Amino acid sequence: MNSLFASTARGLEELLKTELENLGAVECQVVQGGVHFKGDTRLVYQSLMWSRLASRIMLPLGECKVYSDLDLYLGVQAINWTEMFNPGATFAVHFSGLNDTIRNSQYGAMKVKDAIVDAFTRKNLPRPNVDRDAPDIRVNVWLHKETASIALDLSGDGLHLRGYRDRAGIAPIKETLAAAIVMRSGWQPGTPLLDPMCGSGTLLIEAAMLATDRAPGLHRGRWGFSGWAQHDEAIWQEVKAEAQTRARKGLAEYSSHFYGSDSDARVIQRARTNARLAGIGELITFEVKDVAQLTNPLPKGPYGTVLSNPPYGDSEPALIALHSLLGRIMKNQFGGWNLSLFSASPDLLSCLQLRADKQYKAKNGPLDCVQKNYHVAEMVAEDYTNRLRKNLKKFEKWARQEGIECYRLYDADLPEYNVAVDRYADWVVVQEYAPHKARQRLFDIIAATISVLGIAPNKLVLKTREKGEFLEVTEYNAHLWVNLTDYLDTGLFLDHRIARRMLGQMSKGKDFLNLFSYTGSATVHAGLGGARSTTTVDMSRTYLEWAERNLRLNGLTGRAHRLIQADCLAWLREANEQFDLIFIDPPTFAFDVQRDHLALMKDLKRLLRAGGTIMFSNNKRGFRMDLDGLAKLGLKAQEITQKTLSQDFARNRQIHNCWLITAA
Incomplete structure (x- = not known):
């Protein structure tokens, strides 16, 4: 019975535990930023191949109290490095966490690093080379509150690298988060999935791998375990082979489809290459298309879901029209569909004018984000809109008669919409006067004004408080x-x-x-x-x-x-x-x-x-x-x-x- 630890993004631990348990793990304990679990050596390789949520998976080697450097050196040497490295294995130490004795982290690492080398020098063995880029042996140490924990990193590279993109990198959404977002979406595998703002396709690609039983580790080139002497190749060969069989059948049996689109030709072309590298490209269609002209590719059914991570960025008037039109297009063409959206802007989501029935908070690096799920069936400040339509009728006629180009369309007429709307030739200014509720009410006034004037978000300017x-x-x-x-x-x-x-x-x-x-x-x-x-x-x-x-x-x-x-x-x-x-x-x-x-x-x-x-x-x-x-x-x-x-x-x-x- 081995003891493992997987790390994840805060917010994903419970999801991680369920996933670990589903693939056989026993005795799971969620903790902050990860999940302790246990299983036989098969289960270890099985979890490395199959977890979509884990950042890294590791083998705890021990732990010790750390006053003085000496405790630490001695603690590290209690582990039997000389006969755990395969001959020629390179290594690296990752050290996080601080206390009174280890005041700097790279000091933490340097010391562990010396302690491991001195285990080799002492037995008149040659010193292992440290290789930061791609060590065969990666050792993590995590210092929390006087205890230091040492583990072998079996991932090697972080597990979000499935092998379909790029070691570097920097995706707006890590492949692990994307998988979570798909799991939380209310999407039903086997039903169409569509993302009209797909960027590089990560959400669609994770969904297709997950739907077609295609393991996250299937296409990786490198692991942490290969320079480790306790490595069991026969077992890893079984996991590998089972992975192949399961992927071949899921792909061959799949009958639904994936639809992605973006207005940027450059990302669509990366999405297409990415999907293809993931083994899954026959199941997805990417096109260069603007949300404005978004059509339901299956007007006769089956219903599916639309999933997406829209922009948030001023460009506020353009973003409001974008969210607002999306909402309108959902209702018009995707009646019956499930909608799920991941954003850093709840205010912008409110522009869809749909009531969410489920919601999740998540960090995407240093940016707070929500995911909301909506069901689309099958008038947005009527008050303000009414007065506007009418003022427009009256003042447009009047201005043309009078030969004037710049005039007030709306001047705080309704005290519950305390705004001015000015026309200057082809442009339009809205000036907020005095009062998240309010911002959403401002968004509603902007959405409505744009709609009523039939203008173009480019040409509205918002000057506020x-x-x-x-x-x-x-x-x-x-x-x-x-x-x-x-x-x-x-x-x-x-x-x-x-x-x-x-x-x-x-x-x-x-x-x-x-x-x-x-x-x-x-x-x-x-x-x-x-x-x-x-x-x-x-x-x-x-x-x-x-x-x-x-x-x-x-x-x-x-x-x-x-x-x-x-x-x-x-x-x-x-x-x-x-x-x-x-x-x-x-x-x-x-x-x-x-x-x-x-x-x-x-x-x-x-x-x-x-x-x-x-x-x-x-x-x-x-x-x-x-x-x-x-x-x-x-x-x-x-x-x-x-x-x-x-x-x-x-x-x-x-x-x-x-x-x-x-x-x-």
């Missing part, structure tokens, strides 16, 4: 630069469009001034209306550079168009020149619009040529114009806020209020 392609856009006759992703705002406030169009009509032969100019869109409108000159002032160099670029865009360059970088309040206090048309649109907040607007109109009065107009805007909620103070200043104010409110901003209840201030 928490490399700049600028876009050329029109506003009536003006052309403007926007940047949809890089700044707090886009370079264009759409609700002011009518005031801007008004500046345009009022402008021929006029000296125009624009204060708190931001990106200067209003200056562009005034310049195209035949301003005789424009002066555009703002405190931000970035925003004036953009202003300038907007002017350039409309052929408005040269001596007649000035941009000035100043605090506008000081520039007002100090300026001499006069203007026919002053557009002024300050921030609400040493300046408060409510308190200060009167002192503003005082200074602005001296800048205002006889006959001129000032157009004054602000967006303070409950702004009161001091009409009394204006009349004192020999000024009159005419409110045009209604005349300047645009339809896409009507049911807003936030208010840009607007005034034409003139003389007496």
Whole structure:
């Protein structure tokens, strides 16, 4: 009765125990990261050939207490190396674990290594060579809490290398995890299995080996036991031969099929070679195909399962559409099917709009992942979608009528979806305002908006709570630069469009001034209306550079168009020149619009040529114009806020209020 240990990924131990027991193992004890078990020497070779879940399988050689190096040296030498190595066998030591005496792991290894060599030097035998890459004898030692455990590694190479891929390597999913994922999938061997995002095919290949009774060790080239003198070749020959017979019959008897697809031609071609190396390639069909055009290859039945490890990665809008469309295609074409998915993004899985009936947690290196299983039978924020479809009908018609390219599709209409949706030509921005539940609710709003607009995930930009392609856009006759992703705002406030169009009509032969100019869109409108000159002032160099670029865009360059970088309040206090048309649109907040607007109109009065107009805007909620103070200043104010409110901003209840201030 031999005593063995198999290691695995944390989370797989119970699966491992069942598998070990099924192939004959007795007296199994799960422990953290592995499974102690026992069996005769046949059972040892049988477990090496047949375990799909084990990382390594090992033969414990002993164990000792480790204070002082000496304990360790002495502990190691209690084992009879000289007559366990076959002559010429190379070796390596893997040491993990630390304590007070062994403070470094490579020290741990070096010491064991010396102790083993000194077992040979002592008997006037030649020193065994250490060979890190492919030793014939690999010895593991695991130091935990003053005890050191020594084992011979019978795997050699880790057992996930079935022999159908590559010693190096780095697969997103190790072959052992893949096997687990298939076992947990609810997939029934003998029924079709399909993976529409298959990458290199590992999930499909593990399923086909497992279904066709094809042993994980069948195609390996190397084991840990071959340099070991207690090695029993006759027994290993029996296991080997039984493996062959079982594989030949499983493959020949199999009647279902495997379907894999990916949009990447390069991985499909690796998947195809991998499947073929695994002996199983006649049972799988790989094609280069996008999930979008995914069809059920058996529309008349039998039902099977769809299994997959979708991407998760921003590319959020694209990923949401991907998960969302997958869900839609499942329901449409795979009615009756079992679905199982392995992801690092539960939020993305929620986009399928299916309720999982089973779920598993698993680590895939340093990344938490779930696997969820779904059964597909045989409306996703109706609320929000409804208002959107309708707003789209109303505003699309309106925009085309009005010759406008950039407008608000949705402005927090429903208080339970607190988002803005803006259209800029072919693009779309959604701005989250204020509130996993919430993220999924955001995903649902994005999924829905994409669906309702019939747009293209590429062209939606999400700017939320928490490399700049600028876009050329029109506003009536003006052309403007926007940047949809890089700044707090886009370079264009759409609700002011009518005031801007008004500046345009009022402008021929006029000296125009624009204060708190931001990106200067209003200056562009005034310049195209035949301003005789424009002066555009703002405190931000970035925003004036953009202003300038907007002017350039409309052929408005040269001596007649000035941009000035100043605090506008000081520039007002100090300026001499006069203007026919002053557009002024300050921030609400040493300046408060409510308190200060009167002192503003005082200074602005001296800048205002006889006959001129000032157009004054602000967006303070409950702004009161001091009409009394204006009349004192020999000024009159005419409110045009209604005349300047645009339809896409009507049911807003936030208010840009607007005034034409003139003389007496």
